[PDB]
């Protein structure tokens, strides 16, 4: 049960600081060297820092000055203090452990950092129904579009977990400091229009959670 659990990833403006807490369990922490590795939105992995069992820090030159790796060996916790952030510092921040000469053997699931001058704007909810009596044949597709929210990410559902097959839920694209996110779903022409469907969507920051059943025509 080796567990690593990252904390405190948020939005903050270019130039502000932030502390990430990674909480270890299921192995003698003080015997392991701990590292932060971040993944950029375009999926490039980048080593950030690493601290010895014996409290020796290691940094690459671009990370020195603005990052401080540190550990609590008694309440087993790892800490990254990030100061004066750029848009480059936007990524998933995974903590992970290596023993000695050995390479990292286990990564936490990571806390998410976004750093930009955009503001907590809530999403807007609109469904998508095409059929007025035509292509009422084999099957039909329904849609659920969310436009202009910040920050990312947002999580949705179809009837609070119902539909596994046929659901497509597309990755947010940025227009200009405004995220838009579509999702679809296919059904037998037997289940619609009969079983009316509602996509539940919830924004993390604004905590907004408006539901919207798919309309008839």
């Amino acid at each position: 049960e080796v567990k690593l659990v990252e904390s405190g990833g948020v939005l903050v403006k270019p130039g502000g600081s932030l502390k990430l807490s990674c909480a270890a369990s299921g192995f003698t922490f003080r015997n392991y060297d701990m590292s932060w590795v971040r993944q950029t939105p375009e999926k490039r992995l980048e080593w950030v820092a690493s601290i010895s069992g014996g409290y020796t820090t290691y940094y690459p030159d671009i990370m020195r000055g603005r990052f401080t790796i540190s550990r609590d060996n008694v309440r087993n916790i790892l800490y990254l203090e990030m100061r004066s952030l750029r848009s480059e510092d936007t990524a998933m921040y995974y903590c992970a452990r290596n023993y000695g000469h050995d390479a990292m053997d286990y990564w936490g699931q990571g806390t998410s950092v976004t750093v930009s001058s955009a503001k907590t704007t809530a999403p807007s909810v609109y469904p998508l129904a095409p059929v007025c009596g035509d292509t009422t044949g084999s099957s039909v597709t329904l849609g659920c579009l969310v436009k202009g929210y910040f920050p990312e990410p947002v999580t949705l559902t179809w009837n609070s977990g119902s539909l596994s097959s046929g659901v497509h839920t597309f990755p947010a694209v940025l227009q200009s400091d405004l995220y838009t996110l579509s999702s679809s779903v296919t059904v037998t022409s037997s289940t619609w229009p009969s079983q009316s469907i509602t996509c539940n969507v919830a924004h993390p920051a604004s905590s907004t959670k408006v539901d919207k059943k798919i309309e008839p025509r």
Binding site: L45, W47, W107, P130, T141, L145, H168, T169, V173
Partner: protein
């Protein structure tokens, strides 16, 4: 020490051999391979060049020395489709850009669907017309719109999905974003889906209401 993973994205049919390769800027004692799938941490997979992590099937092998390394799946399985980063920690830790393994399928054309704006969106004073080009293969598609027959390709927010777990097909979501003033200035709104499957496109349209 720049690690270099060519190709950055590739495809193989279950049963085939797959050999990924990692080339180090400069010589290293050991390379290490991480498997990442979408919405997880990277998992350690092969370490110390050769040594398979616990859990990792025997089909996976890790060869190499000095400056060139390769990971070889003997018998590809749908299961193995993920991005595979290589990584060294001999000098300051670094990673490759990772090659991405996708599952090769038979060719499929898409279930296209066009939808005119919701009442609450048209209310707000901005039209967005959505086309769901769903469940095709290959990945490679281009969509073009025609606002009253004339090819208009501005305000178009395209978004693909990661390959499907069940059917191993790709799917796309096109969003033409006009204003109400603009939407109340045309009639025809069509959706040209061009793909490898036919020479003849798969169109789906609506002339505003009714």
């Amino acid at each position: 020490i720049v690690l270099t993973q060519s190709p950055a994205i590739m495809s193989a049919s279950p049963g085939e051999k797959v050999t990924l390769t990692c080339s180090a800027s400069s010589g290293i004692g050991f390379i290490h391979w991480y498997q990442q799938k979408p919405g997880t941490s990277p998992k350690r997979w092969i370490y110390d060049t050769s040594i398979l992590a616990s859990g990792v099937p025997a089909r996976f092998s890790g060869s190499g020395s000095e400056t060139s390394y390769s990971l070889t799946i003997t018998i590809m399985e749908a299961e193995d489709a993920a991005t595979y980063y290589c990584h060294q920690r001999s000098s300051y830790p670094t990673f490759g850009g990772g090659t991405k393994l996708e599952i090769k399928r038979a060719d499929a054309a898409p279930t296209v669907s066009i939808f005119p704006p919701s009442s609450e969106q048209l209310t707000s004073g901005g039209a967005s017309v959505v086309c769901f080009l769903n469940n095709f293969y290959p990945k490679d598609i281009n969509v073009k719109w025609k606002i009253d027959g004339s090819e208009r390709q501005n305000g178009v927010l395209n978004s693909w999905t990661d390959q499907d777990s069940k059917d191993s097909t790709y799917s796309m979501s096109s969003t033409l974003t006009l204003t109400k003033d603009e939407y109340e200035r045309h009639n025809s709104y069509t959706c040209e889906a061009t793909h490898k499957t036919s020479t003849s496109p798969i169109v789906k349209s609506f002339n505003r209401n009714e």
